[PDB]
C-alpha cells in the first residue's frame, strides 16, 4: 500500500511482515492444538496403565501369597511333626498291640536311657546295650490314651533271670530200627536242666539265645546220659518204635546227619570236587566244609547256602533352575534426566523472551 | 493517517504473545511433574514388584525339589520304612523291595531245573510269603540288603489232612497232620500250620517233620495193628464231639445229646443216632450239636460302595488390549510430526 506519514514506501516493509507474523502467531496457537491435545490424552494413556495395575496385577499376586502360603503349612505339617505321623499309622493297622517296637515310636536314645533307668545290674545292662536289635524284637508298645493334644502309650520291655548258661540244639535221627522223640533247646539251671519242647520260642543269634520261662520243661541233669545208654536204669527217655524200616536224613545248621538204609541210594557231593562218597546202611555224620549237596533217594539236599549275584538300581541327581528379574533403569532414567535437562533449559528462552516488558 | 490503527492490535498481540508464554506456564509445568508421576511408577516397580516376584521364584521352586524328592525316589522311600519297624528281618518280601521282574530274573538265575522254575513262576504269590529280606549295609549313598529265597527237594507227592473223631468203651485217636510221599518212607507233620494253604499245593519244611513207614496207611482199618503201633487216647467215659473239615463234617454224637443236620433252604434234612457218621457240605450248611450250632459252608454277606467323583482344575490367563492403545499412541505420534507443519511454515519468515 501507500500510507502518507506512516512510512510511505515502507508499509510492505513494516506491516506486511506484521501480517506475516500474525498468522505465524495464530499458527503458534494452532500448534498448541497439536501440542496440548496429544499430551492431555497421554494423561489418559498412563491412567489406562494405572487402571491395568489397579485390578489385573496388584490384587492378583497377594491372593496367591495366601494361597501358596498354605502348602508351607501342609508340607511343613508333614515335615517337622513326622515322628507323630508314623505312630498314627501302626495303631491304625496293628490295633493296639504293636510288635516289634519301631524306631520312630522309640528313637534309639530313649532306649539307652530306659535301659539305664531300670534297677537291674550293669552286668545285664551292658549286654542289653550289645544286642540292641534282639531286645527290640521282644519289646511291645500298647496304646493307652490318644487324643487331639494327648498321645500316651505303654512301652514294655522284658526282664531276665539267668545269664550265660550253655546251650545246644538237637537233631535226632532214626537208628537201627528205632527213632527218637526228644528234641529241643537245653539250658543249664540251678540244680536243673531247662528244656524247651517248642521249636521256635527262642531267638536266633550266633552265640546267644533268649527264651521264655512260662513255656519250658525242667529236667534233672542225668538226661545227658540218654546219649550213651538208651535204656538208662537211672532214667530212660522216650523213643518211637519201628520194626526194620525207614530211611531219613536231618539237616543241621553246621552239618548233616544221614540214616541211609536198605536199597536207598545215598550220596555226598561237592560243587567243585563232585561226589566225595556214598553211604551204607546205617547212621553216619558229615561236616559242611567239604559237603554242600546230599542226594537221598531222589531228594537233593543243600547244606551250604547258595550264592546268587549282585544287582543295581541306579539313578542320577537333579538340578533346579530359574531366572532372576532385571531392568536397565539408569540410562533410561538418565534419558529422563536428559528430558529433565530440557525442562530447565526451557527456562533460558522463557525469561529471555519475557524480558521485553522492561 | 491511521497511526493509532496499526498500533492498537500490536498492543493486543503484545499481551497475546505474553499470554502465549504465560500459557507455557500452564503447559510446561504439568508435564514436568508428570515426569515425576511416571518416576513414582518407576519407583513402584523398583521395589514392590521386581524384588517381590523373584523371591518366590526360588522359594516356590523349593517344593519341586521336595515333592520331586519323594516323586522320583519313591522306591527307596518305602524300604526305609519297614526296617524302621520290622527291624532288620522283614517278612514277607514286599513289592517295592522286589519289584516283580527281579523275581523273574532271579528265578532264572539259580542252577535249578526248569521243572521247578515254571512251578515257581506259577505260584508267584506263595513263594513271596516264604521269602525273606535282611538289611546288611545301609548308608547315605549305600543301600545293601540280603534277599533270601527257599530251595526245594521234592515235587508232586500226594497229600491229605486228617480229622480224628472219638469212636466207640469209647476211645479217641491222637494223630493229625499232613502226609507226604517220601523215598522209602512217609513224611509226617505234627504241627498244625507249618504248611501253606493252596487249593492243590502245599509247601512245608523238612527240619520240622516226622518220618514214618508206609504201613501206617493200614491204621485206618485195624486199631491194634501188629504192623504198626497206631496211636490212641484211652477213655471209658463217653464224650460227644464233632469235627469240621474243609469239605465236610464228622460227628461223634452219643446218648442224650441231640444232633441235627440242616439246610438253609430245605430246613432240617435229618438227625443222628449214637455213633460216628459223615455228612457232605453240598446239601449241609449248619449242624447243631447240643446247643452249639456249627457252620460248614461259609456265609455270604453283601456288597458295599464308597463312591467319589473327579475334580477339575481352573485358572485364568493374563491379557492386555495393547494395539489400539498403541495406535492411540501412534495417534499422538502423528500429532508430533504434523505439529512440524505448524512449526516450519510459521518459521519460514526469516527468509
Amino acid at each position: 500500500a501507500i500510507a502518507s506519514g506512516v512510512a510511505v514506501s515502507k508499509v510492505l516493509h513494516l506491516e506486511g511482515e506484521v501480517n506475516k507474523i500474525k498468522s505465524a502467531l495464530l499458527s503458534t496457537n494452532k500448534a498448541v492444538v497439536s501440542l496440548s491435545n496429544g499430551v492431555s490424552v497421554l494423561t489418559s494413556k498412563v491412567l489406562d496403565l494405572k487402571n491395568y495395575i489397579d485390578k489385573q496385577l496388584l490384587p492378583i499376586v497377594n491372593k496367591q501369597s495366601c494361597s501358596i502360603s498354605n502348602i508351607e503349612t501342609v508340607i511343613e505339617f508333614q515335615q517337622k511333626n513326622n515322628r507323630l505321623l508314623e505312630i498314627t499309622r501302626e495303631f491304625s493297622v496293628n490295633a493296639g498291640v504293636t510288635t516289634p517296637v519301631s524306631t520312630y515310636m522309640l528313637t534309639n536314645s530313649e532306649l539307652l536311657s530306659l535301659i539305664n533307668d531300670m534297677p537291674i545290674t550293669n552286668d545285664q545292662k551292658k549286654l542289653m546295650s550289645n544286642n540292641v536289635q534282639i531286645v527290640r524284637q521282644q519289646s511291645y508298645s500298647i496304646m493307652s490314651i490318644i487324643k487331639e493334644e494327648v498321645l500316651a502309650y505303654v512301652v514294655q520291655l522284658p526282664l531276665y533271670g539267668v545269664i550265660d548258661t550253655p546251650c545246644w540244639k538237637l537233631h535226632t535221627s532214626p537208628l537201627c530200627c528205632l527213632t527218637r522223640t526228644d528234641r529241643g533247646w537245653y539250658c543249664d539251671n540251678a540244680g536243673s536242666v531247662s528244656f524247651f519242647p517248642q521249636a521256635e520260642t527262642c531267638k536266633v543269634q550266633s552265640n546267644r539265645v533268649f527264651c521264655d520261662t512260662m513255656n519250658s520243661l525242667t529236667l534233672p541233669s542225668e538226661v545227658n546220659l540218654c546219649n550213651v545208654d538208651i535204656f538208662n536204669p537211672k532214667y530212660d527217655c522216650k523213643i518211637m518204635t519201628s520194626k526194620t524200616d525207614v530211611s531219613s536224613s536231618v539237616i543241621t545248621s553246621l552239618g548233616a546227619i544221614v540214616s541211609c538204609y536198605g536199597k536207598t541210594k545215598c550220596t555226598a557231593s561237592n560243587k567243585n570236587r563232585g561226589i566225595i562218597k556214598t553211604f551204607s546202611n546205617g547212621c553216619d555224620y558229615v561236616s559242611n566244609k567239604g559237603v554242600d549237596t546230599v542226594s537221598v533217594g531222589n531228594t537233593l539236599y543243600y547244606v551250604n547256602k547258595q550264592e546268587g549275584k549282585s544287582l543295581y538300581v541306579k539313578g542320577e541327581p537333579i538340578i533346579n533352575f530359574y531366572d532372576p528379574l532385571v531392568f536397565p533403569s539408569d540410562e533410561f532414567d538418565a534419558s529422563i534426566s536428559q528430558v529433565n535437562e530440557k525442562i530447565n533449559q526451557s527456562l533460558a528462552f522463557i525469561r529471555k523472551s519475557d524480558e521485553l516488558l522492561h | 493517517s491511521k497511526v493509532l490503527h496499526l498500533e492498537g492490535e500490536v498492543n493486543k498481540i503484545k499481551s497475546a504473545l505474553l499470554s502465549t508464554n504465560k500459557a507455557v506456564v500452564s503447559l510446561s509445568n504439568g508435564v514436568s511433574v508428570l515426569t515425576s508421576k511416571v518416576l513414582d511408577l518407576k519407583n513402584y516397580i523398583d521395589k514392590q514388584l521386581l524384588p517381590i516376584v523373584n523371591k518366590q521364584s526360588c522359594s516356590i521352586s523349593n517344593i519341586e525339589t521336595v515333592i520331586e524328592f519323594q516323586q522320583k525316589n519313591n522306591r527307596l522311600l518305602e524300604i526305609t520304612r519297614e526296617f524302621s519297624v520290622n527291624a532288620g528281618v522283614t517278612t514277607p518280601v514286599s513289592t517295592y523291595m522286589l519289584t516283580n521282574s527281579e523275581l523273574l530274573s532271579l528265578i532264572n538265575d539259580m542252577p535249578i531245573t526248569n521243572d521247578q522254575k515254571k512251578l515257581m513262576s506259577n505260584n508267584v504269590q506263595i513263594v513271596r510269603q516264604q521269602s525273606y529280606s535282611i538289611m546288611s549295609i545301609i548308608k547315605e549313598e549305600v543301600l545293601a540288603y540280603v534277599v533270601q529265597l527257599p530251595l526245594y527237594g521234592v515235587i508232586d507227592t500226594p497229600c491229605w489232612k486228617l480229622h480224628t473223631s472219638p469212636l466207640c468203651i469209647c476211645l479217641t485217636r491222637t494223630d493229625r497232620g499232613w502226609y507226604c510221599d517220601n523215598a522209602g518212607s512217609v513224611s509226617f507233620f505234627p504241627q498244625a500250620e507249618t504248611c501253606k494253604v493252596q487249593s492243590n499245593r502245599v509247601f512245608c519244611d523238612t527240619m520240622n517233620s516226622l518220618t514214618l513207614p508206609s504201613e501206617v496207611n493200614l491204621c485206618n482199618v485195624d486199631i491194634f495193628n501188629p504192623k504198626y503201633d497206631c496211636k490212641i487216647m484211652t477213655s471209658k467215659t463217653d464224650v460227644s464231639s464233632s469235627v469240621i473239615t474243609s469239605l465236610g463234617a464228622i460227628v461223634s454224637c452219643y446218648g442224650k445229646t441231640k444232633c441235627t443236620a440242616s439246610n438253609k433252604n430245605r430246613g432240617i434234612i435229618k438227625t443222628f443216632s449214637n455213633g460216628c457218621d459223615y455228612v457232605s457240605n453240598k446239601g449241609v450248611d449248619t449242624v447243631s450239636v447240643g446247643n452249639t450250632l456249627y457252620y460248614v459252608n461259609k456265609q455270604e454277606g453283601k456288597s458295599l460302595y464308597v463312591k467319589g467323583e473327579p475334580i477339575i482344575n481352573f485358572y485364568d490367563p493374563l491379557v492386555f488390549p495393547s494395539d489400539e492403545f498403541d495406535a492411540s499412541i501412534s495417534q499422538v505420534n502423528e500429532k508430533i510430526n504434523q505439529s512440524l507443519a505448524f512449526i516450519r511454515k510459521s518459521d519460514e519468515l526469516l527468509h
Partner: antibody
Amino acid sequence: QLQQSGPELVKPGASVKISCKASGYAFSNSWMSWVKQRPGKGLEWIGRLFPADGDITYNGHFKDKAALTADKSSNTAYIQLSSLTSEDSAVYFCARMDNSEVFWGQGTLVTVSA
Amino acid sequence: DILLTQSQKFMSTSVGDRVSITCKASQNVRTGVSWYQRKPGQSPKALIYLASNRHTGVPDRFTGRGSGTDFTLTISEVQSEDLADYFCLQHWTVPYTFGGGTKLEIKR
C-alpha cells in the same frame, strides 16, 4: 510214559501233524520237546512246548517250516511239518526232558512220498 | 547260541579202564547241562543230571564233575557192554546245542 506213531511220507505240497501220546503219566504240568537226527549231521534240536498253558518256542532257523500244537485232553502232541525234501528226511523223536521223565519216543521214519 | 567242542570222536584203551572225557563251552552256563549215551537203532539215555546227578538205574562206575565252561565226564572200569555212542547237550537256555558226539572203542 509215551508212545509215538509210525512212519511218514512227506510231499511237495503237503503239511502233516504227528501223534505222540502220554502213556499213563502225570502230564499236564511238565514240558515236551523234539529233536531230529541225520547221520553225517547228527542230532538237531527242534523246539519245546508246554501243554495246557501254551508256551511255544522255536529254533529260528527251523521256525517257519513247522508249527506246534497239542491235545491236553487225550494228551497228544502234534507238529505240522510242511512241504520239505529228502535232505530233511530223518527219524523224529518225541522226548521229554524232566528230572522225573527223561523219556524218548519210538521214532518217526520219514522220507519223501515217491 | 553257545558252541560245544569235544576233544575227539573215537577212543582206544583196554577193558576195565578209566576214561576222562571233557567237552567245553563258550560261556559259563551255571551247571545247567547233561550227558548221554546212545546205541545204534536204540533210544538215548540221560546219565548226569544238572552236571552232577546220576539218574536212577545207572551203574555206580559213572562219574562227572565241572562247574565253569568246562565239564569232565569220567567213566571208570569199562566193559564190553558199555560200548555205546556218547554225547552232551546244552540244557540251560534255549536254543539247545549238542556236544560233538563220541564213540567209545578200544585197542585201535
